UniProtKB/Swiss-Prot annotation, chain A:
Name by which UniProt lists this protein: Transcriptional regulatory protein SDS3
Family according to the record: Belongs to the SDS3 family.
Gene behind the chain: SDS3
Protein location: Nucleus
Purpose of the protein: Component of the RPD3C(L) histone deacetylase complex (HDAC) responsible for the deacetylation of lysine residues on the N-terminal part of the core histones (H2A, H2B, H3 and H4). Histone deacetylation gives a tag for epigenetic repression and plays an important role in transcriptional regulation, cell cycle progression and developmental events. SDS3 is required for the HDAC activity of the complex and for the RPD3-SIN3 association.
Swiss-Prot record, chain B:
Name of the protein in its database record: Transcriptional regulatory protein DEP1
Subcellular location per the Swiss-Prot or TrEMBL entry: Cytoplasm; Nucleus
Function: Component of the RPD3C(L) histone deacetylase complex (HDAC) responsible for the deacetylation of lysine residues on the N-terminal part of the core histones (H2A, H2B, H3 and H4). Histone deacetylation gives a tag for epigenetic repression and plays an important role in transcriptional regulation, cell cycle progression and developmental events.
Signal peptide as annotated in the record: none
Biological classification of the source: Eukaryota, Fungi, Dikarya, Ascomycota, Saccharomycotina
Oligomer and partners: Component of the RPD3C(L) complex composed of at least ASH1, CTI6, DEP1, PHO23, RPD3, RXT2, RXT3, SAP30, SDS3, SIN3, UME1 and UME6.
Lineage top rank: taxon: Eukaryota
Length: 32, 51
């Protein structure tokens, strides 16, 4: 159960990092 | 959405948010099942040694 929970959480934190790079590109987009 | 997602993340890393509580009543059943099988093994073995 430890491995399974933290594996799915690794996926959801790659989701949060998806949004990190999202706001990276919108960071340069506000620098525009 | 940052507020909501990190509130759920640090409200869940304790173990209270819905997703982690939908996989925990699905694995406690598996453990209970394995334990029941162990108990039945010992029950049959001991009542065999007896006879």
């Amino acid at each position: 159960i430890k491995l399974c929970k933290e594996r799915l959480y690794s996926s959801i934190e790659q989701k949060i990092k998806k949004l990190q790079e999202e706001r990276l590109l919108m960071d340069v987009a506000n620098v525009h | 959405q940052l507020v909501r997602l990190q509130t759920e993340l640090q409200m869940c890393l304790e173990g209270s948010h819905p997703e982690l509580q939908v996989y925990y009543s699905k694995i406690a059943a598996i453990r209970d099942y394995k334990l029941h099988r162990a108990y039945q093994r010992q029950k049959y073995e001991l009542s065999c040694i007896n006879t």
